[model samples]
Target: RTIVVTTILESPYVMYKKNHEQLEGNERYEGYCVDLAYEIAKHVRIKYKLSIVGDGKYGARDPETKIWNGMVGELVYGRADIAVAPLTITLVREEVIDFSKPFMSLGISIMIKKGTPIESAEDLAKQTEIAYGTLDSGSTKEFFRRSKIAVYEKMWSYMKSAEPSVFTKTTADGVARVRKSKGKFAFLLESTMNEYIEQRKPCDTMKVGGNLDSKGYGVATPKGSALGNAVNLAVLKLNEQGLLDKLKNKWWYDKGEC
Candidate 1:
């Protein structure tokens, strides 16, 4: 039997190699996530399938429409057996799914277009010259939406009221908006992706201020799945064997963004 795993295309964390662009199936979908997935598969020695999630973003549920999307929705609906992205685990997410111990640490941040006057979360909250938004159905959006963090609470007010205002369907969409909006708007997203973007050319956008909160990325499985515990243990074993650290160094420290 094949375990279906869902992933997204993103720079640094997961991206297709220019050389491997012509490769088909899993060959074209290689990156950090692929390496990690393959490593765990090797350790567990399980048969699995790598499937590109139809949509790119963290998982989320729609209250009014009763629909879902991204990783969370995939597992919730049995579309995939596993999901390993930069998915942060939170209490609300826990209510519906099971998550492994954190594989990586990160926080929510802002991506501002070139020359944007905003310099802090406060800037977004106090001023209206620039619009701000987070990836739909993601931790950043959820953090601000349910934040006890005072600054994020204030920032959420602006996000909630912005008409034709703050918005993003995915992280890619958010980053592209920042790149092309030319300072008209900013994206609130992951710090890891923010840093990855900062070093690239036309690197106008900057991650302003520090992280709003601390969290970790984990592999998520639907509730009561037998493979959940086995996969989670594989992650810990990988950490103990030092494979995870080496993988991080190979990509993050060695072949970073140009």
Candidate 2:
């Protein structure tokens, strides 16, 4: 029996092949998580297949329908067996599905154009001319929206509007938007991606305000799924084997954060 898995097209995490974009299943979405998924299935002695989600949603619950969306929807509603995306471990999300121990830790950070005058989240919130935004339905966006902090709350107001608005489907798109901004758009995203982008040749962006909050990227399984314990242990074993560190350095650092 083939276990169905749903993944996203976010770069570094997941990406469609430029050469073979329409392959779906095994021919598409060959990235960090995709490779990791294979390793997990190999360890657990199960066959699996990968499919990109039709909806762009990142597994967040809709307030109206009160149901989950994207990959989360797949598992919560029994559409897929597992999700290996960078789905964050948030309290709201945790209530719906079980998560493997975070394979990685990331803090929310702001990426601004190199020449931009903004220095911190406070600067972004204080300025009206230079607009800022975070990924929609993401942990960082929720943080700004519900935060009691004065500056963060104000940033949410502008984010709720802004010229181009402040949301994107993926983190790479957010980084690209920030980079293209001659000195305008600023993006709040994971520090991992921020640091990755900073080492690029055109490296015109930098991360500021350190980390907004600390969180882990987890492998998600359907609630009470029998494989949940095995998957979680797989992650710990990989961590101990140095495979996780090897991949991080190989893809992110040794490769100069490509």
Candidate with maximal TM-score: 2
lDDT of each residue in 84-164, candidate 2, tens digit only: 877788887788888999998898888888978877887777777876778887778877877887877788887887766
Give Cα distance to truth, residue 239, candidate 1, Å: 2.1
Top-lDDT structure, candidate number = 2
Model 1: which residue pairs collide?
A: none
Tens-digit lDDT track for model 1 on 1-258? 788888777666678868776787677766678898887777677888888788776767777898778888889898989987778888988998899988877888878876788878887878777778887777777777887778777888878887875667767788888888878888888887787777666667778888877888898889889888888999999888888788776766565444
Instruction: For candidate 2, list the clashing residue pairs, or say none.
Output: none
The whole-model lDDT of each prediction reads 0.80, 0.81
Residue 48's lDDT within candidate 1 is 82
lDDT of 2: 0.81
